[PDB]
Swiss-Prot record:
Domain notes: In the N-terminus, the macro domain displays a mono-ADP-ribosylhydrolase activity. The central part called, the alphavirus unique domain (AUD) has a zinc-binding function. The C-terminus region, also called hypervariable domain (HVD), is mainly disordered and binds several host proteins. This intrinsically disordered domain contains 2 SH3 domain-binding sites and 2 FGDF motifs necessary and sufficient for the formation of nsP3/G3BP complexes.
Post-translational modification comment from the UniProt entry: Phosphorylated by host on serines and threonines.
Binding site for ADP-D-ribose: D13, N27, G35, G115, V116, Y117
Effect on the protein of changing V36A: Partial loss of mono-ADP-ribosylhydrolase activity
Function: Seems to be essential for minus-strand RNAs and subgenomic 26S mRNAs synthesis. Displays mono-ADP-ribosylhydrolase activity. ADP-ribosylation is a post-translational modification that controls various processes of the host cell and the virus probably needs to revert it for optimal viral replication. Binds proteins of G3BP family and sequesters them into the viral RNA replication complexes thereby inhibiting the formation of host stress granules on viral mRNAs.
All copies of domain Macro, residue ranges: 4-163
UniProt membrane topology term: Peripheral membrane protein
Subcellular location: Host cytoplasmic vesicle membrane
Signal peptide start and end residues: none
Name of the protein described by the UniProt record: Non-structural protein 3
Species the sequence originates in: Chikungunya virus (strain S27-African prototype) (CHIKV)
Length: 163
């Protein structure tokens, strides 16, 4: 565990993270995909061997000894708000189980379902609160990766608000 488990946010490519493992915003079929998923495919392509997994689940594949936790959030184009919310919460609970099982002291994580799976809605708060619900009981240092300066400010504010 981390000596004083923390949350942090950084505005940069999660493929350049300084953590002991990464969470991919995966698609269910293990395809190279778009956005975060494509950056993860480019950096850790070996981790896409048998990475396909259902919506609401996480499957870890090693790249060398570096764990890639493929977490499949719902595409809010396809899911109802209600069902999508349930699956988005579930994907984060499976991420917490994987981070715990791996024994890492740190994890790089994107906000699931906030990009091409957002259904064109702003899901910063929805996605971040499900991240917190899942990860608060873990003792890993969590570093959230985002690309927008205003999302960085909002994520940083939400972290600092809880102390
Ligand atoms: Cl960058
Ligand atoms: Cl997404
Ligand atoms: Cl972002």
């Amino acid at each position: 565990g981390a000596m004083a488990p923390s949350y942090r946010v950084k505005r940069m490519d999660i493929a350049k993270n300084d953590e002991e493992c990464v969470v991919n915003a995966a698609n269910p079929r293990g395809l190279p995909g778009d956005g975060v998923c494509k950056a993860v495919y480019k950096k850790w392509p070996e981790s896409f061997k048998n990475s396909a997994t259902p919506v609401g689940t996480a499957k870890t594949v090693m790249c060398g000894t570096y764990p890639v936790i493929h977490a499949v959030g719902p595409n809010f184009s396809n899911y109802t708000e209600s069902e999508g919310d349930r699956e988005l919460a579930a994907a984060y609970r499976e991420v917490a189980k994987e981070v715990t099982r791996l024994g890492v002291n740190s994890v790089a994580i994107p906000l699931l379902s906030t990009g091409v799976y957002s259904g064109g809605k702003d899901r910063l708060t929805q996605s971040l609160n499900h991240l917190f619900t899942a990860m608060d009981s873990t003792d890993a240092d969590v570093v959230i990766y985002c690309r927008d300066k205003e999302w960085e400010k909002k994520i940083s504010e939400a972290i600092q608000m809880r102390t």
